[PDB]
Amino acid sequence: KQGGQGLQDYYLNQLRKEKILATVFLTNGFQLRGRVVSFDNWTVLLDVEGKQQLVFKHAISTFSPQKNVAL
């Protein structure tokens, strides 16, 4: 649903469902290693060693997963 974010929504939903570990590079140069708990259009909820991280997507540069998502 909602066009122009089919890749984005699918990919983050795969990361979350598959519990794939990923490095999330922020545009400020900081980085987090975690699993996707949830997302909406503007934010992602992360688990980093049992603590919760709410990351704004405008702050995100890259997702780097441990293993690839099936397309």
Residues near a copy of itself, by CB under 8 A? 2-8, 11, 25-30, 32, 37-43, 45, 51-65, 68-69, 71
Shortest distance in whole angstroms from residue 65 CB to a copy of itself: 6
Least Å distance, CB 35 to a copy of itself, is 14
Which residues have C-beta within 8 Å of that of residue 23, sequence separation ≥ 6? 31, 32, 33, 62, 63, 64
